[PDB]
Amino acid sequence: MQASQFSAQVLDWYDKYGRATLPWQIDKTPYKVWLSEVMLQQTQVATVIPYFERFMARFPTVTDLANAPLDEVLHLWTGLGYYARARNLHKAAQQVATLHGGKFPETFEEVAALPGVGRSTAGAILSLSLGKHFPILDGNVKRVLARCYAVSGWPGKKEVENKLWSLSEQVTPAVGVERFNQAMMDLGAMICTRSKPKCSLCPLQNGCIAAANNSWALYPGKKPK
């Protein structure tokens, strides 16, 4: 299906089934989306929710986070795992306070320059909180795109990653980007699951190659070895 149809079908689906109840999806700000993306990186959403709230209550602004002792930040992080994220989070907060006057940057270069923030995360922060025209490519998106467009290579390979980034850019619209990007992550997390995807509940089922061939297990490709 055309890229235009892809985004339209995804947005229509999101309007009907979209659930934006999470704390970081309400009254969004770059700071809140950033904080949530880092916590959600390697931790289940159910587990994250209470921590997000505790962090927002203790650190209303990025400057409050920056000024706090690293040890307190690490203590509040206890239970989320992968503490390297917490250390980069604090450094990023300090960078924002030092280089951007306490105002979380709203430009791609400046956001991506932050420790612990990559290309996809920077795009998610700006698109979700400000509606900036940037695509994302997390585990969820890679799976949906790989299956819909039959990209069987291992994303760990540069050429395959570039291919997926191009597909994401191609289907990602400017109008409604905030809803489209959140929709794609929701689709990849709740519908197009790693195992036995629920294609009958997927807005892309009519044009998805994996669905047509019942070959979802082939996309994305797994690390060769």
Ligand code: SF4
């Ligand atoms: S139709 Fe099935 S395999 Fe294709 S994207 Fe939707 S859930 Fe994933």
